[PDB]
Each structure stands twice: as C-alpha cells, then as structure tokens.
Amino acid sequence: TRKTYTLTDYLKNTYRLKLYSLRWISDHEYLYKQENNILVFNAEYGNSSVFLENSTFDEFGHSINDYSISPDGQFILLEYNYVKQWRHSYTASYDIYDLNKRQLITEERIPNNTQWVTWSPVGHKLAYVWNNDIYVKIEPNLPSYRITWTGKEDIIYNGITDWVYEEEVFSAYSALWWSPNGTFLAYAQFNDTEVPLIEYSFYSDESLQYPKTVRVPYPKAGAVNPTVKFFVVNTDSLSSVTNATSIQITAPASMLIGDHYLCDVTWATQERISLQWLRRIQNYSVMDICDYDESSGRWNCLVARQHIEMSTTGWVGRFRPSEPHFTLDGNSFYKIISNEEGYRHICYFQIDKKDCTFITKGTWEVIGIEALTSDYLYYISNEYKGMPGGRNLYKIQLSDYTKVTCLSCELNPERCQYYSVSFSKEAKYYQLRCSGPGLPLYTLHSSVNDKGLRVLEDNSALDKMLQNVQMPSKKLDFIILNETKFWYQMILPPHFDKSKKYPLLLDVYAGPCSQKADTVFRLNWATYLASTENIIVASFDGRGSGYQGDKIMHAINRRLGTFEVEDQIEAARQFSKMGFVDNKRIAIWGWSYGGYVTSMVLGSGSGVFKCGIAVAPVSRWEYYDSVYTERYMGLPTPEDNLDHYRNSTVMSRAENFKQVEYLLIHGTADDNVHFQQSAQISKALVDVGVDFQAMWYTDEDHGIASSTAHQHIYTHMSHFIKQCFSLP
Amino acid sequence: TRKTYTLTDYLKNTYRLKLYSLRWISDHEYLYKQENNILVFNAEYGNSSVFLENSTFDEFGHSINDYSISPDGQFILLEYNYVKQWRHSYTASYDIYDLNKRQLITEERIPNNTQWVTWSPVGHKLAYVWNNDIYVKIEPNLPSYRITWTGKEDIIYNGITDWVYEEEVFSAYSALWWSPNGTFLAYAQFNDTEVPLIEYSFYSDESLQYPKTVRVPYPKAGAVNPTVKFFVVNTDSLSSVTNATSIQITAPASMLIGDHYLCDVTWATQERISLQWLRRIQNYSVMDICDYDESSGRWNCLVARQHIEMSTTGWVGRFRPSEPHFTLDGNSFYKIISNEEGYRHICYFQIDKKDCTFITKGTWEVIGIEALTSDYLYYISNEYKGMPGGRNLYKIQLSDYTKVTCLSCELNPERCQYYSVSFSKEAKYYQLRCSGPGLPLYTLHSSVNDKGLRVLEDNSALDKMLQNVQMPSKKLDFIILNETKFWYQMILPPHFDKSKKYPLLLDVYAGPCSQKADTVFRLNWATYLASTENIIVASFDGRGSGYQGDKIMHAINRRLGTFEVEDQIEAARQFSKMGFVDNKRIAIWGWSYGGYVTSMVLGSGSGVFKCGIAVAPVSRWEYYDSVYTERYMGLPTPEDNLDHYRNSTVMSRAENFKQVEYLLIHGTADDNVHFQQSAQISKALVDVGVDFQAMWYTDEDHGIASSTAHQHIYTHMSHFIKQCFSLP
Ligand SMILES: CS(=O)(=O)c1ccc(C2NOC([C@@H](CC3CC3)[C@H](N)C(=O)N3CC[C@H](F)C3)N2)c(F)c1
Ligand SMILES: CS(=O)(=O)c1ccc(C2NOC([C@@H](CC3CC3)[C@H](N)C(=O)N3CC[C@H](F)C3)N2)c(F)c1
Ligand SMILES: *[C@@H]1O[C@H](CO)[C@@H](O[C@@H]2O[C@H](CO)[C@@H](O)[C@H](O)[C@H]2NC(C)=O)[C@H](O)[C@H]1NC(C)=O
Ligand SMILES: *[C@@H]1O[C@H](CO)[C@@H](O[C@@H]2O[C@H](CO)[C@@H](O)[C@H](O)[C@H]2NC(C)=O)[C@H](O)[C@H]1NC(C)=O
Ligand SMILES: *[C@@H]1O[C@H](CO)[C@@H](O[C@@H]2O[C@H](CO)[C@@H](O)[C@H](O)[C@H]2NC(C)=O)[C@H](O)[C@H]1NC(C)=O
Ligand SMILES: *[C@@H]1O[C@H](CO)[C@@H](O[C@@H]2O[C@H](CO)[C@@H](O)[C@H](O)[C@H]2NC(C)=O)[C@H](O)[C@H]1NC(C)=O
Ligand SMILES: *[C@@H]1O[C@H](CO)[C@@H](O[C@@H]2O[C@H](CO)[C@@H](O)[C@H](O)[C@H]2NC(C)=O)[C@H](O)[C@H]1NC(C)=O
Ligand SMILES: *[C@@H]1O[C@H](CO)[C@@H](O[C@@H]2O[C@H](CO)[C@@H](O)[C@H](O)[C@H]2NC(C)=O)[C@H](O)[C@H]1NC(C)=O
Ligand SMILES: *[C@@H]1O[C@H](CO)[C@@H](O[C@H]2O[C@H](CO)[C@@H](O)[C@H](O)[C@H]2NC(C)=O)[C@H](O)[C@H]1NC(C)=O
Ligand SMILES: *[C@@H]1O[C@H](CO)[C@@H](O[C@H]2O[C@H](CO)[C@@H](O)[C@H](O)[C@H]2NC(C)=O)[C@H](O)[C@H]1NC(C)=O
Ligand SMILES: *[C@H]1O[C@H](CO)[C@@H](O[C@@H]2O[C@H](CO)[C@@H](O)[C@H](O)[C@H]2NC(C)=O)[C@H](O)[C@H]1NC(C)=O
Ligand SMILES: *[C@@H]1O[C@H](CO)[C@@H](O)[C@H](O)[C@H]1NC(C)=O
Ligand SMILES: *[C@@H]1O[C@H](CO)[C@@H](O)[C@H](O)[C@H]1NC(C)=O
Ligand SMILES: *[C@@H]1O[C@H](CO)[C@@H](O)[C@H](O)[C@H]1NC(C)=O
Numbered sequence A, B: 001t002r003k004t005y006t007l008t009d010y011l012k013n014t015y016r017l018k019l020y021s022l023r024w025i026s027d028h029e030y031l032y033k034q035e036n037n038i039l040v041f042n043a044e045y046g047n048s049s050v051f052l053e054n055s056t057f058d059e060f061g062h063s064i065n066d067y068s069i070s071p072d073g074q075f076i077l078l079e080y081n082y083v084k085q086w087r088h089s090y091t092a093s094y095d096i097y098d099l100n101k102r103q104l105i106t107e108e109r110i111p112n113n114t115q116w117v118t119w120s121p122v123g124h125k126l127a128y129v130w131n132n133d134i135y136v137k138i139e140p141n142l143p144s145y146r147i148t149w150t151g152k153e154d155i156i157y158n159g160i161t162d163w164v165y166e167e168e169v170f171s172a173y174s175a176l177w178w179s180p181n182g183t184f185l186a187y188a189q190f191n192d193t194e195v196p197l198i199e200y201s202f203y204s205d206e207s208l209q210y211p212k213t214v215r216v217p218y219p220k221a222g223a224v225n226p227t228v229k230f231f232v233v234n235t236d237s238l239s240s241v242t243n244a245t246s247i248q249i250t251a252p253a254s255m256l257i258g259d260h261y262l263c264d265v266t267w268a269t270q271e272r273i274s275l276q277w278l279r280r281i282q283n284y285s286v287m288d289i290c291d292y293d294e295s296s297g298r299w300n301c302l303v304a305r306q307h308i309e310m311s312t313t314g315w316v317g318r319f320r321p322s323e324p325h326f327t328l329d330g331n332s333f334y335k336i337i338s339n340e341e342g343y344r345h346i347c348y349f350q351i352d353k354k355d356c357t358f359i360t361k362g363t364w365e366v367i368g369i370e371a372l373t374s375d376y377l378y379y380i381s382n383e384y385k386g387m388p389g390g391r392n393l394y395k396i397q398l399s400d401y402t403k404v405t406c407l408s409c410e411l412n413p414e415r416c417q418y419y420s421v422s423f424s425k426e427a428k429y430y431q432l433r434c435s436g437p438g439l440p441l442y443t444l445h446s447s448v449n450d451k452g453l454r455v456l457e458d459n460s461a462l463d464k465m466l467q468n469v470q471m472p473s474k475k476l477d478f479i480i481l482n483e484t485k486f487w488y489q490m491i492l493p494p495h496f497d498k499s500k501k502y503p504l505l506l507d508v509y510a511g512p513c514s515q516k517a518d519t520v521f522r523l524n525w526a527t528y529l530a531s532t533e534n535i536i537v538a539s540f541d542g543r544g545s546g547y548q549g550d551k552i553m554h555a556i557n558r559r560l561g562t563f564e565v566e567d568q569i570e571a572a573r574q575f576s577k578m579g580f581v582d583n584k585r586i587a588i589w590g591w592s593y594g595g596y597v598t599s600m601v602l603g604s605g606s607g608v609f610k611c612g613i614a615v616a617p618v619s620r621w622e623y624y625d626s627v628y629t630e631r632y633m634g635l636p637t638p639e640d641n642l643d644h645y646r647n648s649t650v651m652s653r654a655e656n657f658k659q660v661e662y663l664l665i666h667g668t669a670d671d672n673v674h675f676q677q678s679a680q681i682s683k684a685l686v687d688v689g690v691d692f693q694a695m696w697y698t699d700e701d702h703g704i705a706s707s708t709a710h711q712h713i714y715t716h717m718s719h720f721i722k723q724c725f726s727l728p
C-alpha cells in the first residue's frame, strides 16, 4: 500500500521541511522566532529567554512584515506595508520601538514609501533612502540629515540600485556602505537618463478600468548603460555643519576610457575602502584601495595599491569579480581568483604588492570565504571526494597553510554532503546547515575547539511522516565525454528496476556557471513525477557549468546557445543508452535559461525528444539585459559578436518545431525576461504553420511564484507531461 | 469517392465564390474591373469598352492598392503605400493621372501619409485630410487650400473621426460631406483632449529590440468622451490670399445640456443640410434641418423643422438613428423608424410637420431604403414568407401605399432568398445580388418595367466544382419560447441520418440586433466541421436579436449578459433533446460578443456544454467603449446601472468553469476588445484553481486575420473541438 508523493502534496506543502533561521546579535547570542515571539539564545549553554513577547505589537494597528535590532540592542526597527518590487527591492513603512523605554517612537519618523533602511554597523545610527535621496538619523527620534538632492524617479538613484545593478551586479537594492565603526557612509549614484525603457502592461485587479503601463530603465544588450559615481560622507560631521560634503572617488583612468561598472565595495578599516571596477567588456577589472587623508579631508587611492584582475579565456569571476576579505589591520586580504590551471582558489594579497600567493590549490574550487580571524580562515569548497556538487566547511591555519582541517566532512557523511555556515560576530560560534543528500540538519558548534554543542533541528518530525510514503531516490554520478567527466543526477521512481523502460524528463537550466547536479535534498515537482508518475527526472551539467574550473565554464564564452545546448542533447542519448529509458518517451523542460535551452533543443532537429516545456524563456540575446548578456556574449555589433547574437535565437529554428510537442508559458508582468521573448517565439511558430500549446499568466513575473499561479502552472504542466507520455 | 470540404479547403480558399462588384458612374453605365482592366458597361445592351489599360501604369514603380475615377471621368486617383489602421481608417499615398491627356500630374501632388481623400460628388474637385487637417483642391494640378489649422495627432481631428466615432458611429474614418453639386463641404471636428488612452505593447518584427507601446484615445464605459463641432465651408469662394472661413452649426439646446454625439449628416439639397444628434443616454435624438441663408452667408436651422426621435423601451435605431432620404425638392423625406408596435417601418416626413405617416406596416421589418424616385421608393425587407432571415427588394407606389410589389421574391425562390441591391444614378437600373441559400447570383434589371436584362455572374464554375464534394446542408427553422418564435439554423453533415446521434457545436454571437440564423450561403469553418467531421453546427437568435421588432431586440436593454445568454442555453437544451443530437457532446464557440456569451454560458453551471471556445471576448462591460456599451447599458454609476455592470462579468463566474473544457484565445494587439479582457478572465480562473487552454496571438488585432494567424487559430481550434468530441 503506502501512498506516494502526489502533486497535491507538493502544491499544498503537506510534507513541510523544517529549518532553523537564527540571527546572531553578538559573539555568543542569537535570536530565534518560536511561536510569534522572539527569543534570545545563549550559544554556550543553549538556554534562552523571551527577548520580545509576541503580544507586544497586538494593537499596533498593522501587520509587521519583519524586524531589525540595532547593533547596540537599544532599538528595534519594525517593517510593515511591505510592497515587493523586483528580486531584492521593495518599499515599506517603518517605526522604531525603543527597547529601553518600551515605547514606540512617534516623532521624526521614517517617511512612508522608504526604499531602503539600514542601521549603522555599530550603535544605532540609521541611514535610509526615500524618493531616491539619502538621509541619515544620528538618533531615532531626532530629525534626519539630507545627504543628496539629486534624487529623481527612474533617473537618478542615490544609495539604491537601478534595475540592472540590483539584478546583475549587486544582487541587492541598497547601494550604501557604512564604514566599520559607522563614522563614514559610502554610496553609489546611478544615472539612467539615457537608458531605454522596457514597457509593458499591468492589469491589476478587475476594478482597474484602464491597464497600467509599467515603465522601467532597462539596458538591453548593446544599449546605453547607466553611468555611476561613488561618494563618501563623514556622518560624524553632520551635526556640526549645515551641509556635509560627499567626497567623490573617481574610477581609474583605465576605466574612464570607456563604459564601465562599479562592481564591489568593501571597507578594509575605519579609514580604508576598496573598490572594484569592471569594464563593459567584462574581462578586465581594477581594484583601488583608498585611504582617508585627515589633512585634505579627501580620499586617495595609490596606484601602488591598485590590483588588476583579468581573463584571457572568459569574463572575470563566476558572475563578477570576487569580494576581498581584509585582515584586521587592513594591510592584506584574501580573495578567490582562478589560478594558472583555471581553478578558483584563495590568494593572499599584500595591499601594495601586485603578486599574490595561493593558499589552496587542486582540481576543485573554493566556493566562498566565510570568516577570517587573526589565526584562521574558514571557507567552503567542493574538494571532498572530488564531488563538485558537494560542499563542506574547511579551516586553514594562517601561520601554516599545510594545516587544513575539514570541519564538516565527517560529521555524518551519508546524510550530510552539502553544507552552509553562519558564524557569530567574532566567529566564536558557528551554525552548520546541512541540506542534503539526507533531510536537512542544523547544528551549533564552538570555534574554540570545533566541538558540536548540540542539534538545533534534525527534521525527525518529517522523517517520521515520509516513512509512510513511497519516496523516490536520487542518484548522483558522472559520464566521461572526451577524457573529461560530466556530472548528472537522476530522481528515480520508487522500487526502480533497471530491467524496465521508464519515460525520462530532462530538467534543464544549463546557463553559465550553473549546477543542476548536486547533493541537495529537495521536495519538488520532480519528486511527484518520479514517485507518483514513475517518471525519471534527470539533470546534466555540461560545458559552461560551474565549480569545475574555467576549462569547463568558459567553454561557451562568446558562444551561448551552442555547447551547453548540444551537451544536454548528448546527455539524453547517453541516458537512453543506459537501458532503462523508453526512447519513445523522452521529454525536456526548463525555466528561464532552462526555457531557452529547452527551446533551442526542441528546435535542433535531433529527434531525441518527444515534447518539451519552456517557462519564461530567453529567445534572442538582444532582448536580455546588457550586464548579464555582454558578460558572455560581448557586444552585438558587427565588429564584435553580432553574428553569433543573430545565430543563437530560438526563432530561427521555428520550422524544426514541427517534429515535437511544445508548451510555451510566460508571465505578462515579467520584468526580467520580458514577455516580449515568448511573444516573438509564438509569432515565429505561427509564421511557419506550427501548432503548439501556450499559456500566459496575467500579472505574474519571472518567478510565477504567486500562490494561485504556482499551483496553476504546475498542474497545467503535469497534464501536458502525462499526455505526452500518455500515462495517461 | 467524392472528398469532403476539408480544413485546408477552407484555409486555402480552394473553392472561391465569384462576385461582380460594379461601380455606377451615371444613370446607365458602370465600371467593372476585368483582368486588371477597367471596363465601362452600358446597362441597356451589355456592351462594354476598355476604360483604362491594365498596362497603363506598367512602369508606375508602385503597387496600386485601389483606384477612384472622378465623377466626370476626367481623372483617376491612384492609391498606393497603403497602411491599415483600425476597422476603416488607413493612410496611403496618392497620385492623379490625367485621362484626357494620358499624363501623370506631378505638380502640387497630394501629400504622403494622407488620411482620407474623396472626389466632389460632381466634377473633379478634391478634399483630403492630412495631419488631421482638411485641404481642398479645385483642380488636380493646382495648389490646395488649407481649410483647418487646428489639426493635432491624438487630440484634434478635422474631417476624420477618432477611434470611437470611426467604430461605433460613422463606420468610416471619413468625417466630411460634400454638398450635392460640390459647392459646400461640410465637416465635423472631434476633440479628444480629455479622453483617456488605451495602452498596449506591439512587438513588431524580431529585429525590434524594445517593444513599442501603442496608445489611442479610447473612452471606456463612463469615461470622458470626445466632443464634436460641425462646420460648413464654401469651396467656391476660396482664396489663396485669405484663410477659408468655416461656418459652424451648433447642436440644439436639448443636446448642448449634456454629453452628446453627432450621429448623422445628410444633404437634402444644394442649400439644405440635415443633422441628427444623439444624447449620451442614447434614447433621445434630434434632427435639425438647416438652410443656407444667401444674404447672411450663415446656416439657419428653423426650430419648426426640428424632429425628435425617442425610445421608451430602449435606444434609438438599430445601432443609431436611421438616415433620412429626402425628395428632389428637399421638402419631405422618408426614414425608417420603430412604429407603435415596435417594428421598423418607413415613415414619410414633411420637414415642417411633427407627425410623420408610416407607409409600410406589419410584423416584419424594413432593413433599408435603397432608392427613391417621384413615383417609387425601393427598399429591402424580411417580409416575404415571414422569414426574418430572408431579404427581398420591394417598391411601394408613393401615390398609393396599398400598391406594394416584390421585385426579387419570385425570381428564383429555391436558390434566392437573401438579396442586397445596387441602383444606378437615377434608379433607372439596379443590380440584384442574391447570396443564398443557393450559390450567389448577380443580375441586372431595368426599373421602367422591372425587366430582367441579364445574368452578370451565376457561379456556374463553383457549382461544377462543388458537385465533386460531399457538401453539408442547411436547415433554417424555429422553436417556440413563451408564445414567441425564435429562429435557428443547423449546418447538417452530408447524408444526414436522423437515426444517428451527432455531436453539436453552437456557433454564437448573440449581441444586440444580431442575426446568426439566415438564408445566406457560406463557405467557412462550420462547412468543414459538418462536411469532414460530421459535427452539427447550430446558431440561434434569441432575445436581443434583430430584425424582429423591439419586443425582442429591446428585451436585453440595460441587461446585457442575461436573456441572450439564457436563451442560448435553452436552445442547446432543446437541441439536445432531439433524436439526432449526442447530448454528451455539445460544444459552444463565439468570437467577440460571441466570445462573451460563450464564456457567460460556460460559467453558468447549466451542465449542458462539455467544452467551449472564446475568441477575443468581452469579459466586463466597463472595459468596452462608451458609445456601444452605454447604448445598451446606460452609465456605470450607482445612480444609473452600476449594479448590473458588476453582475454581468465573466470573472464572477470563474468557479463554474470547473466542470467544462475551455479554450481562451486573444490577439495581443486588439485595439477593439483589449487583451485586458482576456487577461482578467485567465487571472480569475487561475485564482479559483480551474485549468483551461489558452492561446495569445502576438500583434494580431480583433480580426486575427493575418494569413498565418488565421490558419493557425482555426487549426488550433479544430484540434480542440475534435479532441473534445473524441473524433479521429
Ligand atoms: C541552481 S540552477 O537552477 O542551476 C541556477 C538558476 C539560476 C541561475 C542564474 N543565473 O543568472 C541568474 C540571474 C542573476 C543571478 C541572481 C544573481 C539572471 N539575471 C537571470 O535571471 N537570467 C534570466 C535569463 C538568464 F538565464 C539570466 N540566475 C544559476 F546560475 C543557476
Ligand atoms: C452577423 S453577426 O455575426 O450576427 C454580427 C457580428 C457583429 C456585429 C457587430 N455589432 O457591433 C459591432 C461593432 C460595431 C461596428 C458596426 C461594426 C462593435 N463595435 C464591436 O466590434 N464589438 C466588439 C465587442 C462587442 F461585441 C461589440 N459588430 C453584429 F451586429 C452582428
Ligand atoms: C543563560 O543562563 C545563564 C545561567 O543562569 C545566565 O547567566 C547570567 O550570567 C551573568 C554573568 O555571570 C550573571 O550576572 C547572571 O546572574 C546570570 N543569570 C542570572 C539570572 O543570574 C544567562 O543570563 C542566561 N541567558 C539567557 C539568554 O537566558
Ligand atoms: C545624468 O546624466 C545626464 C547625461 O545624460 C546629465 O544631463 C546633462 O546635464 C548637463 C548639465 O546639467 C546638461 O548640459 C545636458 O544637457 C544634460 N544632458 C541630457 C541628457 O539632458 C545629468 O546632469 C546627470 N545627472 C546627474 C545628477 O549627474
Ligand atoms: C548641499 O550641497 C550640495 C553640494 O553642492 C548641493 O548640491 C548642489 O546644489 C546646487 C544648487 O541646488 C546645484 O547647482 C548643484 O548641481 C548641486 N550639486 C550636486 C552635487 O548635486 C545641495 O543643493 C546643498 N543643499 C543645501 C540644502 O544647501
Ligand atoms: C571610528 O573611526 C574614525 C576614523 O578613524 C574615528 O575618527 C578619528 O578619530 C581620531 C581619534 O582617534 C581623530 O584624530 C580623527 O580626527 C577622527 N577622524 C574622523 C574622520 O572622525 C572615530 O573616533 C572612530 N569611532 C569610534 C567610536 O571609535
Ligand atoms: C451648386 O449650388 C449652388 C447653390 O445653389 C449654386 O450657387 C448659386 O448659383 C447661383 C447662380 O449663379 C448664384 O446666383 C448664387 O449666388 C449661388 N449661391 C451660392 C451659395 O454659391 C452653384 O452654382 C451650384 N454649382 C453647380 C456646379 O451647379
Ligand atoms: C431614457 O433612458 C433613461 C435611463 O433609463 C430614462 O431616464 C431615467 O432613468 C432612470 C434610471 O437611470 C429611471 O429611474 C427614470 O425613471 C428614467 N426617467 C426619468 C424621467 O428620469 C429616460 O426616461 C429615457 N427617456 C425616454 C424618452 O424614455
Ligand atoms: C454601347 O453600344 C452603343 C451602340 O450600340 C455605343 O454607341 C453609342 O455611343 C457611341 C459613343 O458613346 C455613339 O457613337 C453611338 O452613336 C451611340 N449609339 C446609341 C444607340 O446611342 C455605346 O457607346 C456603347 N457603350 C460602351 C460603353 O461601349
Ligand atoms: C479641445 O478641448 C479642450 C479641453 O476641453 C479645449 O481647451 C480648453 O480646456 C482647457 C483645460 O484643459 C482650458 O484651460 C482652456 O481654457 C480650454 N480652452 C482653451 C482654448 O484652452 C480646447 O480649446 C479644445 N480645442 C479646440 C481646437 O477646440
Ligand atoms: C512623400 O514621400 C515620397 C517618397 O519619399 C516623396 O517623393 C520623392 O521620393 C524620392 C525618392 O522616392 C525622393 O528623392 C524625394 O525627396 C521625394 N520628394 C520629391 C518632391 O521628390 C514625396 O515628395 C513625399 N511627399 C510628401 C507630401 O510628403
Ligand atoms: C506567542 O504567540 C503565539 C501565537 O500568537 C502563542 O501560541 C504563544 O503561546 C505566545 N507566547 C507568549 C509568551 O505570548
Ligand atoms: C504614513 O502614512 C500613514 C497613513 O495615512 C499616516 O497616518 C502617517 O502619518 C504617515 N507617516 C509619515 C511619517 O508620513
Ligand atoms: C577582452 O575580451 C575582448 C573580446 O574577446 C578581447 O578583444 C580583449 O583582448 C580581451 N582583453 C583581455 C585583457 O583579455
């Protein structure tokens, strides 16, 4: 008997995955949300107390979306009226509650429609962006100091990013950086005056008589990009002068010669800041390190401290130049860069010496630097067992690089191979977060001796429930293509029998530096398909995929829509030759880049696939944004890479779609991959007389994450897959 | 053994109906285009001559879209660079060729991007509109006179109509009216300053990087409407030294009190013009009769010559007040109006007498007045055999109304029951166009003795081809509902066998004053469905339908989405109870108003229909234009008819779609029924978890008629219907 994992189970979230989200507030205390109220926990012993009882804001008159405690614990920022914008941006209202007097501040309050707010790293100073201008409050109940007057809707952005910087450069909306002790406030200013606008309709609720036209500054490939400027203001002088001066720090001459980007800002000390700039042609970046000059009140970046990072085989960085991690005295820093072999490792830099020293090496890569103390550097890599899809925490002794300890590898090797970490303020404690291949496991550890303090959440409740269900299994392995290994994973149906022919669905993404083959545990649509529909769901990381060196990642440089597309087809062949795949029932599907690859694959004329589903796909690179697209494709001009731009479109393969069943889906309010992209695919298919299935989702964006739409799209896709595989 | 009428046959027009479109140029001659040659025919004998060689412009260097010979035969206007706009509007380039001197005028030529152009009714003067302003050319080779200078894109229209006037009032882009002999040129001016704009994306060719946004002044129900003014200018006294003077004729005070419309302009004589005005609440209209005052130079409209036309059960006229047909001296006129019984008949009016006399009467209606002489008035009505879906030509003796003669009834009763007609200049000759139930038949007749001169086109070629294919038959009949009879038609499959059960598709439109049950012969999608798929395609005219009196037509007044929807369900219900219908396979489909009714039906919960297809449907009346919507629904305010505006939406019925298969289709560039309407339907279905099929057509408008799109929609719908009926 035993029920299987059904579509409803996924859509209704019957089997809930538990997690343990904590927020360190010091070197040994963290906050945890247990039953609406906020408790504070002692890391050392595990005892807690009620920090803020849930019944505190009952008669607030508003539903509170999130909170934020000032560094000194004296105040708490309350956020409500949350109105989402793009991937990271949103607007909201805020009130400050005085935790000492247990009162709600009612004077000089933060304006409504505040675009971004942030406490100073120390104390309780506040900085926020409202109407595209920056303001600063030294004290929560005192008036604000205006920092900028140039703010202008869709034109000038001070302290916040425009659309493309938020999405492709900073993975954030804020563009301001408090110095370590809060004295200085740095920030970027974006000018989109000449940036073309993407325009599309938003219908809103039925009650809106006339549709609204959403207009946003968005640079498509080869178009005019926003320009940027960087400034630094001394907040400590605000109460002493009428208008504190924003000292500007200009980009290096090597950047000013053409279009460029401000791509990283990292403070090194109270009076030292590092900036990384990137040329519009993303294979050259410069890092300036600037010191405050107490005599001229100016900021100077000595060329002797400038560092150049370039790439001859591709772009710089996985998605951008990596962040530096400075030693306390700010005289040296560690940074991940690809070595002579093409693998990303940690290099140790002296701020005024151009030659760095690699402290790690091998045919594997460092994923990120997680913490740095005067004695140790902690990082996550995929070195363990040579599995690029695994992740573990490591510790390296700064006084002896030959001393490297893996802190997570052997904790529970069968259940935990994909780790994440969170250190306390001074890295005295760290929470480990295991996400697979077994059920997620959260543990707390002491850094002084790397001893396990205790288990925070083991997901026993769910393990219990899953016992009464025929869950699918997952296989992570590899195939060798041209003396090089390529990893794939398969979500196999329960009681899998290799003596049978199962229908196969290729789950694909395959964009640059992607990884669809890993050791993470997921409860998703593929779970339902394998468990209930007895469908094998596979994923393959071929050329262009990440975390396996530049040889593989830069294979698609300037050539998107080629190798990553072909390898995916070859993967299908390879799978069919494994003998447990029904060659007559092989389907392919993907979202976003996966939608593009799926479409390109369905229109290649390979004959391997019977049907496929593309959700919010890219159809021609000239329609996607500049930062992302140009990174891999360069410029769409005849003197650069225009020919391949025009050669890698979905539309040019419309005719071959007569050989397959296709389902095209897109959200009408997708601000990322514009509906325009599918509108052009559909028109090309209509023009050559090809029938296909389509579905638009009114007012949904790139994620189609709305509760109702989410249930609707997966239901619709399920019927299509079952029909194509005629289950029925 | 005899093929059937296939989908390809319909889509490739393999079976073409022959026509015979002629143009009367005098009381005894007409122009007919043959082999691209313009021939002139003598109506009395049938002899012809070549009027213009198909090779005359053999090296014109432009594709000629259309041509237009001046009334005096001296010149010919050549139209090229045609670019379509809405239903009737478009811009083009023109050149004038001198027929007498066989030369192409090259001096003072009409501008490119001209919006409208027309010859004076007599002679060869010209009036064209360019950049929203009116120009007049007394001679083809002479400079033109600027009449208006207020022209402004999307704001002020002179001589041309705005979006709503073009579509809902004049069924023409043109807004200028030449006096009978060309002395005066009357014109209307529209002001859309405060009219909101409908905005939508147009994607264009793949090469366009950024979608363009189209915006057109379009007043939705309740919104601010455009205002109108009327002017008359003397084209005989124009000066190259002074700006033309236009005399304004203001609307009556009973109209100026509130919002209103100019709905008809008709010249009575060389110096008398009639105008009809309609209040925004379309149940009260006023006709003004204005005479030119030679001494004053002004136009006066005596209040004593004012005629009011109102309605207590509904709006005025079928879609607007009918046009008057003045006698030679202009002292009296005939006009179709609804009588005390609610049936539309011809009433004889004296210009200075309030009461008019009806000259026809009966439980049938006059469709239109076609020609008037001192002895006879010719008209088309559905009186014959009491069939409201039949049309015949009649003449009534103006000196003895008891003497009524049908001129088309008995010509060929089996083959011809639906005629339209074309009279020559003085009604000396008329062409009859029979369009059903048999193949179209065109004939020429002489009025003096109503003789049948000859057959112009009998479609004997098509008849010879059609006998080689198993064509379906059409049954026109009626059912009774509450002592009232309602007509329906059924397209029955070849070799119809009433002992068998056939699936049934209800083809519906059902908008106010519509007629889907008639005797017209058609080669369409239904032909293929019955001939090849053996599906019965039925249509029904319930409450709200036209040509049967106001008791029926006005039944849905201020109540759209009620009785016309309910009656369709009743009809299907009754057809389902017939021996030859498979009550398990009953479908419904419609386009435009038919899309709305199909949707309202599917969301009714009647359980009668298994599936349905809605193309470019209206979903809520507040989204449609003011002129058409308010005509039937009044204003959407709480004081007027808001409750019913809110109760008649498709969206409120979403939940009821759970038990039916629904395919929703709409073109993204529909300027008439905005994509918005379908976008809200899909969102409501998604919001209640109901699955359905959808298809958008990039850049297609309300007609979805581009060649490839047309083939694609009918192909996609064919698969859907066959699948719903389990048909191979
Ligand atoms: C885990 S996965 O499914 O393999 C996966 C999924 C998604 C990405 C990925 N790559 O670029 C993005 C993301 C920026 C990134 C957030 C910082 C990018 N901007 C994006 O959304 N698109 C849309 C079209 C094209 F695919 C790029 N997201 C990725 F690298 C890997
Ligand atoms: C011959 S039929 O299929 O019954 C038929 C088809 C179409 C009409 C009809 N009614 O109003 C229009 C047309 C007026 C202009 C005269 C052309 C109107 N504006 C329209 O396109 N819509 C869209 C939504 C709503 F249904 C009305 N067309 C009609 F009265 C009858
Ligand atoms: C966790 O429990 C410990 C032990 O009871 C608390 O320790 C406080 O430690 C300080 C420093 O020595 C003493 O002054 C206090 O007397 C101790 N607590 C008390 C009430 O006496 C600690 O406060 C607890 N932490 C939390 C978050 O509950
Ligand atoms: C944003 O950049 C634009 C340039 O595109 C700047 O606009 C120029 O400003 C100068 C001086 O005011 C004028 O002479 C030019 O006419 C402007 N050009 C344009 C496009 O109009 C603008 O000043 C910048 N804004 C800020 C705050 O730096
Ligand atoms: C604060 O100082 C800044 C820096 O000068 C002022 O910004 C200048 O304002 C003037 C006049 O408004 C403009 O001509 C300049 O273009 C502005 N410069 C910049 C950097 O934008 C700002 O107006 C001052 N505010 C107050 C209240 O004095
Ligand atoms: C935060 O760092 C700033 C920058 O060094 C400190 O301000 C300097 O303080 C020294 C005294 O130690 C003075 O000589 C300088 O004039 C100050 N410079 C500036 C720009 O203010 C500041 O004292 C530090 N804050 C704290 C709380 O330690
Ligand atoms: C069209 O009709 C107008 C108006 O009746 C004619 O113009 C009148 O002609 C008479 C005879 O010459 C003059 O006495 C009047 O003063 C004219 N009135 C106006 C308003 O112009 C005109 O002749 C006719 N045009 C044609 C071509 O027959
Ligand atoms: C034209 O129709 C309107 C609207 O139906 C009539 O005006 C009034 O409409 C309201 C509802 O909107 C009713 O309560 C009134 O009874 C209607 N009559 C009056 C006098 O207000 C109007 O009567 C109609 N005109 C004609 C000639 O029938
Ligand atoms: C049709 O035929 C008649 C003669 O049968 C043609 O002739 C008439 O017009 C000619 C010039 O227009 C004259 O030369 C004839 O005298 C005159 N004959 C009669 C009886 O009126 C007439 O033009 C022909 N029409 C066409 C269009 O070809
Ligand atoms: C077209 O209509 C507009 C608006 O009704 C007319 O303009 C006016 O409305 C303005 C408010 O937007 C008032 O401020 C103006 O006083 C009023 N009149 C003028 C001349 O501005 C406009 O005149 C109309 N245009 C024409 C050519 O008739
Ligand atoms: C309308 O456009 C046409 C085409 O551009 C103009 O005709 C000429 O076209 C030739 C080439 O086709 C050009 O060299 C000329 O510049 C155009 N103009 C002339 C006078 O030769 C035409 O003139 C335009 N007319 C108007 C009123 O816009
Ligand atoms: C906090 O609130 C939750 C839900 O409102 C409740 O279950 C819990 O008992 C509350 N605890 C306290 C201390 O108020
Ligand atoms: C924010 O909006 C609320 C809602 O009207 C208003 O009452 C409040 O005063 C506003 N606060 C500020 C700082 O503007
Ligand atoms: C950067 O890439 C461009 C495009 O291939 C190339 O022309 C240039 O030489 C590269 N620069 C470096 C430093 O590799």
Ligand SMILES: *[C@@H]1O[C@H](CO)[C@@H](O)[C@H](O)[C@H]1NC(C)=O
Pocket: B035, B036, B037, B054, B055
């Ligand atoms: C005129 O051209 C057409 C083709 O456009 C041709 O069929 C016809 O023969 C020509 N006319 C004559 C009289 O030859």
Ligand SMILES: *[C@@H]1O[C@H](CO)[C@@H](O)[C@H](O)[C@H]1NC(C)=O
Pocket: B149, B241, B242, B243
């Ligand atoms: C005609 O009127 C327009 C509109 O004001 C004006 O600009 C033009 O100069 C006038 N021309 C003559 C000849 O009066």
Ligand SMILES: *[C@@H]1O[C@H](CO)[C@@H](O)[C@H](O)[C@H]1NC(C)=O
Pocket: B481, B482, B484
């Ligand atoms: C008569 O029939 C109509 C439908 O044809 C129905 O709506 C009405 O209620 C019935 N009774 C009366 C009195 O009209």
